[PDB]
Amino acid sequence: GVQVETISPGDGRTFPKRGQTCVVHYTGMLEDGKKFDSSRDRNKPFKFMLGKQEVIRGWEEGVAQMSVGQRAKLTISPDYAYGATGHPGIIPPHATLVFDVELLKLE
Known part of the structure; x- marks a missing residue:
């Protein structure tokens, strides 16, 4: 269903947990079109x-x-x-999405 291709590994021992919030910054792109969902907030x-x-x-x-x-x-x-x-x-039918996410921290 989904794949995870890492670029810059993290510690490897701290992840999001049940009852936490994830603080992420991403850039959403489509196979070969443009950005539909980015985090340039x-x-x-x-x-x-x-x-x-x-x-x-x-x-x-x-x-x-x-x-x-x-x-x-x-x-x-x-x-x-x-x-x-x-x-x-934004999202046409059958439109595979591709994100570039950076988990920053938990809150």
């Missing part, structure tokens, strides 16, 4: 919680699988992204 990156399903799976599964201080290039397939019905304009 002024002062605060993006922040979500594990076990509430606020972010698609590819992330939840992906980001989790990442450790505090690690950065990767994840590849999400429809099954884990926005199924078959996402939104016309």
